[PDB]
């Protein structure tokens, strides 16, 4: 069983100079610690083998964090709210060299989340689906992870049909944001390597561990 009540509780449980690049790296490292506490609260995750928990978090941490700060920014006016508390707007992002990826995040994620009024239960279920990624390489039992994912979007569909009975396509609309999250995550990861490779931007321990094999 995969109760949406616990997934929402997981989202609620992890709720809390002005250079965008440095703040991005600081925010990612900061939220990696919070991501572990979140995953532990997702039903049945901690029951997986320890090595599989590592595989799933190493494979999805980037998308998981991107989904979080995107939904967190639905109230911001054409901007992104990073975990450090810094609001990055279009002018600041463009001047920092990350104008393109910034635009994608707002048009393909933040604005789409705001327009459909994606709630925290739906967000937590999407992040849980991402967490339970059966395509992750090295999983000792990918079928087991696939079963957990199936339970997640089974409970999500039931939630959407009960909460939004007049939006029959809402469930599919939620899942159809995952392709954008996938490609956006890949581009964001490229910028993180731009920041690290140049050696000019500080990279803290946890984020450094995720960026290395």
């Amino acid at each position: 069983d995969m109760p949406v009540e616990r997934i929402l509780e997981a989202e609620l449980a992890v709720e809390p100079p002005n250079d965008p690049v440095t703040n991005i790296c600081q925010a990612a490292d900061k939220q990696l610690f919070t991501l572990v506490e979140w995953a532990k609260r997702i039903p049945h995750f901690s029951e997986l083998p320890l090595d599989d928990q590592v595989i799933l978090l190493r494979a999805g941490w980037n998308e998981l964090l991107i989904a979080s700060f995107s939904h967190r920014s639905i109230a911001v006016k054409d901007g992104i709210l990073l975990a450090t508390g810094l609001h990055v707007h279009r002018n600041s992002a463009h001047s920092a060299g990350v104008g393109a990826i910034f635009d994608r995040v707002l048009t393909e994620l933040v604005s789409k989340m705001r327009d459909m009024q994606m709630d925290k239960t739906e967000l937590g279920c999407l992040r849980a689906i991402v967490l339970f990624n059966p395509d992750s390489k090295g999983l000792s039992n990918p079928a087991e992870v696939e079963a957990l994912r199936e339970k997640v979007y089974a409970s999500l569909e039931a939630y959407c049909k009960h909460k939004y009975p007049e939006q029959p396509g809402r469930f599919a609309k939620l899942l159809l944001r995952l392709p954008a999250l996938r490609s956006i995550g890949l581009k964001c990861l490229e910028h993180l390597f731009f920041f690290k490779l140049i050696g000019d931007t500080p990279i803290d321990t946890f984020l450094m561990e995720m960026l290395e094999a």
Binding site: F33, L50, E209
Partner: peptide
């Protein structure tokens, strides 16, 4: 460092 992810998942 020292499998910070491993140790964070282990500790309760």
């Amino acid at each position: 460092k020292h499998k910070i992810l491993h140790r964070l998942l282990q500790d309760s």
